[PDB]
Amino acid sequence: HMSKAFDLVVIGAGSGGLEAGWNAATLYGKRVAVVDVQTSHGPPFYAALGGTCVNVGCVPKKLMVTGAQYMDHLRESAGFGWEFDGSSVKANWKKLIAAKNEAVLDINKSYEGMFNDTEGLDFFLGWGSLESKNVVVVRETADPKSAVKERLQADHILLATGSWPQMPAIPGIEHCISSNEAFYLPEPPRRVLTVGGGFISVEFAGIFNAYKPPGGKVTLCYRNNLILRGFDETIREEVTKQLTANGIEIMTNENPAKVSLNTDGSKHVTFESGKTLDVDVVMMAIGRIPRTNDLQLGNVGVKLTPKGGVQVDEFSRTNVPNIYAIGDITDRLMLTPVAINEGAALVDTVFGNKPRKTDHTRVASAVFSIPPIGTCGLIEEVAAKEFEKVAVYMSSFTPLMHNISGSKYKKFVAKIVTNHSDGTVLGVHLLGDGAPEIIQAVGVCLRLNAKISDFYNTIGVHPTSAEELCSMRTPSYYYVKGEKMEKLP
Amino acid sequence: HMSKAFDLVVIGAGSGGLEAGWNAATLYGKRVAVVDVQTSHGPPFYAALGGTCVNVGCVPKKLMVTGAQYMDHLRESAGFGWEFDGSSVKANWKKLIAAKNEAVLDINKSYEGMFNDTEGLDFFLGWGSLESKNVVVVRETADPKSAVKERLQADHILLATGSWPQMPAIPGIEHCISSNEAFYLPEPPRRVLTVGGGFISVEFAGIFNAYKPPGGKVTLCYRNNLILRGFDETIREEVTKQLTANGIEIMTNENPAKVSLNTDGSKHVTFESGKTLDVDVVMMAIGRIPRTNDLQLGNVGVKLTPKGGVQVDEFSRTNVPNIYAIGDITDRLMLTPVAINEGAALVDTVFGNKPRKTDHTRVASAVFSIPPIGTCGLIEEVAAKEFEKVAVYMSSFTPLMHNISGSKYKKFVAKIVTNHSDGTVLGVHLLGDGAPEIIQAVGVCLRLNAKISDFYNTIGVHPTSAEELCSMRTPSYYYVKGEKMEKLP
Ligand SMILES: Cc1cc2nc3c(=O)[nH]c(=O)nc-3n(C[C@H](O)[C@H](O)[C@H](O)COP(=O)(O)OP(=O)(O)OC[C@H]3O[C@@H](n4cnc5c(N)ncnc54)[C@H](O)[C@@H]3O)c2cc1C
Ligand SMILES: Cc1cc2nc3c(=O)[nH]c(=O)nc-3n(C[C@H](O)[C@H](O)[C@H](O)COP(=O)(O)OP(=O)(O)OC[C@H]3O[C@@H](n4cnc5c(N)ncnc54)[C@H](O)[C@@H]3O)c2cc1C
Ligand SMILES: O=C([N][C][C]C1=[C][C]=C(F)[C]=[C]1)C1=[C][C]=C([C]N(C(=O)N2[C][C]N([C][C][C]C3=[C][C]=[C][C]=[C]3)([C]C3=[C]C(Cl)=C(Cl)[C]=[C]3)[C][C]2)C2=[C][C]=C(F)[C]=[C]2)O1
């Protein structure tokens, strides 16, 4: 019936909080408490022990995109001489969802095990909030009036509560779902609208498109001209064509104004334009917002940015000296490995006596579109605002295997962006099979300040898509003080 | 006086020959003649315009491995909810061969077009040999007494005739085939013996295993204890295990003593051990030897190594001034990209004022086994004879998608070999889906003298197999003065 005392209390057992907690306890012998709202994935709170990534993010979406790729594989097999009864082919969504659920539960169960087993690393179930500088309260619900399960005394407090889907305030929003519900749909939708131009909308569009019943149709809508803002424009344009080529309708310059129920219970969507669409599911994927609401940060005066994130310095420190924030709650790069790196850096700094800041530049990342994106570093239009002379090396071709497969639309894109003044690689952008696998080691290259000549003097592995990166010596074009041109004056 | 005058005569229109020829003409404005024995692929001379890679190597074999992969994709799809009539599934070899033939013939025609469209680059059909220091004779056939077609006066001669399958001197060797004939088999063989432990025997075993008719069996035999000599030991053991899991019988410590014809037109193999096996096809893949016999190298005194390669210095010069050799004929690294690099280097040296030598260390390479190998730099047993303290970082697991697919045997292997005294990455060895793509940029990393800490300080792309390379911090074991031990002494 007594409070417990820790060196470190972590609110959120996800990618950042688990890295921080494990490292503090096992590398530096600190007493660590980690709080989360649920021990295993799914409703009601979706995220759980292991975080968004394990439960309703990276791990399950990747298993589901892997399942969806078999639609391409089954059709593309025919060109290589594979024969079977095409009329017999069915996509069983319930088996996919059941296989994903057992894989996720197995990870939930192993994290549970690590906590029951490790010296000075304890798990507390419930909703963590800040009572004071040195006390974390664990309550039965997000409501600050719900019953107190524990009070955790903390010399240091880490906020790592991640993010949550954003729902626009439109009439009939209650007829719409987020990515969270999409993971548990009992049946694959015949007709689905995915709202948003980001990786989550694109990734789900691919998944629904493979698993849709026979009469089915996937529509993606986006309020602006071109999906996947922040990615290379050539790649943005090519992914649009390859989604369309695979039967996904892309509605750009369109946004839902309202949703109502038809008498048959299907969703009637009215866009701002006055266009209408009937679907069985409306999935909002317009963005994710920092999960700061439930932490009662007012109790200790932890400052939020204008945009809603916990404000931090380069060492993840809030304005309250012993309170830190890492991961999606800081509203910057929303990636698992960035959250993990921030967690490991924080603990080495606070407990390890070896200060270290996370480098947020030159981070490798992927989109598991079909086919996928792999990217690291600057897109050319950003490079062009910070460097007087920028060169772009571009190779774009239908791979030979896709001339046999019949997916001629599957153009491989490889782009390298440089500072032409010294040849430093600023950015590498890939579209096509293996692009996420190719881009990891490119991340090491950029952290070692690689120049285009470091790439072109490296001997290719043949035959691969990757060898295109080691075969480009003459720019396709330049930017000179922000202006695009084929040649230097 | 028809005879014609050239700066460079290249014998062999292959990987190395065409790089050299193209660069000499388009970069250095030289007069270039290139000789090959055939304009397009296949019987009777197999190699042709484009070289071994284009016609009977890398390109057709990758397309045929892509075909073989579909056997795994169709089975694995079931775990992700794909349902279809398994009984109706058949692999059509003839359709694969015809699709490969059209892809390759398109490349042959494109190279024809390249000669026609390029100034100072001329193609001659026929058999090239050395008449004197500065004359290349082109005859109708490999016979030195056949009709002369051209006599090419040349300031510089490039030997680039590549390699040829080694056939052992055993009774009934004439009832055996090589990789050359494998590319044109009218029917997929029902029982086949691939002879050799190297990458060609392993790749073909996979190809024949996918396309074998019902009741068929692929056997691979190797004269020593463990296949794929020169690859990482862990990967050699695991690929052996994974080939066995996919139904390929691996016969180690076995070597054909003789082959005889059976009355049904099948082959009767007797091993040195006294064991016997009946097969439809015996594919010998025990090695490749330099293609030097038809060149009449005795006419000018070009020196050969004891092994049969054309002896060259670091700049690809023979003992005879103004005569060079690149690619497989030099019997060093038999990889297309290495031949291409040597060709470029040679032309830069001879006709630029840019003396360049090919670095034959830290060349990335692949085996298109199912699943595949990607490797760059030293295996631990070679590292441990050149360095006092070697650390080995090792990661080995079934990827989660293969727990769902049911191919539980598909262990991904990642190994980093370091100079432990200073953390320098010496070698990276990968077995798993994507390994050939993951390894290309690793090639670039080893030219920026990456340390293990440069890998583990790089932020991961999640979820990928590749991120394993950025997640290994602690050696699994070491070699100290050549001797393996789990701990530093
Ligand atoms: C659909 C989807 C796909 C994604 N795909 C990828 C991808 O492929 N690659 C990638 O790198 N990233 C991906 N992401 C992003 C990645 O999931 C996040 O960047 C990462 O999980 C954030 O880690 P974190 O530690 O900040 O928070 P999280 O991992 O979100 O963990 C926060 C935890 O805190 C808990 N929590 C919240 N409030 C409280 C409270 N008051 N008390 C206690 N516990 C609380 C939550 O239950 C959760 O478990 C994806 C995200 C989504 C939604
Ligand atoms: C089955 C197989 C698979 C392979 N897979 C790969 C792989 O995946 N990756 C890789 O990097 N390497 C691979 N290789 C090796 C690769 O093909 C060679 O290393 C490369 O082609 C060698 O280039 P080269 O310029 O030395 O000769 P080649 O490309 O062989 O060119 C030699 C040319 O000379 C011609 N010729 C020969 N004698 C004469 C003469 N007297 N006069 C005129 N012309 C002549 C031939 O017709 C031929 O076109 C593979 C090899 C084989 C056999
Ligand atoms: O498919 C693919 N990819 C993937 C991989 C592979 C391959 C093959 C196979 F079978 C499978 C798979 C492809 C297709 C194509 C290609 C290439 N390319 C490209 O752009 N590239 C370029 C080239 N390279 C470099 C240079 C060299 C030279 C130049 C001139 C003359 C002669 C020579 C080469 C190469 C080649 C090849 Cl094939 C590869 Cl793969 C790589 C590399 C670069 C490239 C191209 C494009 C387009 C066209 F139309 C053509 C072509 O790709």
Ligand SMILES: O=C([N][C][C]C1=[C][C]=C(F)[C]=[C]1)C1=[C][C]=C([C]N(C(=O)N2[C][C]N([C][C][C]C3=[C][C]=[C][C]=[C]3)([C]C3=[C]C(Cl)=C(Cl)[C]=[C]3)[C][C]2)C2=[C][C]=C(F)[C]=[C]2)O1
């Ligand atoms: O499947 C796969 N692969 C491929 C990719 C993928 C994923 C997912 C999906 F869905 C699909 C696909 C896998 C499985 C598993 C793995 C890994 N691992 C390994 O062994 N590793 C280790 C871990 N990691 C690293 C480290 C970190 C940590 C530690 C401790 C605590 C905490 C943390 C993990 C990670 C990392 C990173 Cl970088 C990120 Cl970003 C995330 C995560 C890894 C390695 C493991 C194994 C086994 C088990 F059971 C589990 C796991 O894999």
